[PDB]
Amino acid sequence: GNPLVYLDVDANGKPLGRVVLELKADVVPKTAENFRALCTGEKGFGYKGSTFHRVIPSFMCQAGDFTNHNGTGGKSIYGSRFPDENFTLKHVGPGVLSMANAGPNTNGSQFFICTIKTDWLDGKHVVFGHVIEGMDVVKKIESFGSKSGRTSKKIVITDCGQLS
Numbered sequence: 758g759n760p761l762v763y764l765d766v767d768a769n770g771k772p773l774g775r776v777v778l779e780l781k782a783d784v785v786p787k788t789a790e791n792f793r794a795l796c797t798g799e800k801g802f803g804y805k806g807s808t809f810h811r812v813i814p815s816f817m818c819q820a821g822d823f824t825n826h827n828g829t830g831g832k833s834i835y836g837s838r839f840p841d842e843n844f845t846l847k848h849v850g851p852g853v854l855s856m857a858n859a860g861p862n863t864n865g866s867q868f869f870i871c872t873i874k875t876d877w878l879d880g881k882h883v884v885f886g887h888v889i890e891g892m893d894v895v896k897k898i899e900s901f902g903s904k905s906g907r908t909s910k911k912i913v914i915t916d917c918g919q920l921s
């Protein structure tokens with residue numbers, strides 16, 4: 758059915774724990790598959806070793822730029838960018854997993870995990886899953902953020918993959 762994937766996250770080389778995510782392949786199969794394959798690394802690239810580069814408390818934690826590590830890059834398993842699949846799922850609260858973008862039809866690999874309800878993003882960012890377990894780990898990441906988005910420690914996805 759829907760993939761179950763994980764991210765193992767550290768701060769300055771010290772493990773924070775594991776975030777487990779359900780990917781809603783039943784609703785957004787192309788977007789879920791991109792994220793799933795970027796977690797396993799099976800296309801030869803993906804999230805392992807990349808950072809949460811923008812973390813804003815009471816908003817979201819953003820990651821996935823594994824090419825430039827600064828929020829300007831990333832790429833999908835299909836190419837540089839792929840279309841917005843649909844906007845069926847909404848930003849209903851903390852734990853929502855959604856695609857970052859540079860406007861319409863610019864999904865690549867960057868994504869974010871919400872720490873509040875961000876419904877003002879509905880219809881603009883493609884939601885494709887949610888946190889199953891590890892929201893406390895997401896809160897630890899959040900604690901190293903700032904209003905500017907700059908982190909006070911280097912937040913790295915040390916490992917990632919698929920559980921089922």
Ligand SMILES: Nc1ccc(CNC(=O)NCC(=O)N2CCCN2c2ccccc2Br)cc1
Pocket residue numbers: 817819828829830831838856857858859863864865866867869882
């Ligand atoms: N393929 C690709 C994808 C993205 C980018 C860089 N674009 C970017 O970060 N846009 C901002 C964004 O997506 N987001 C999601 C949550 C944080 N955020 C936000 C949204 C509304 C208002 C304030 C903020 Br902050 C380059 C290449």
Ligand code: NA
Pocket residue numbers: none
């Ligand atoms: Na369910």
Ligand code: NA
Pocket residue numbers: 815816
């Ligand atoms: Na905000």
Ligand code: NA
Pocket residue numbers: 861
């Ligand atoms: Na269009």
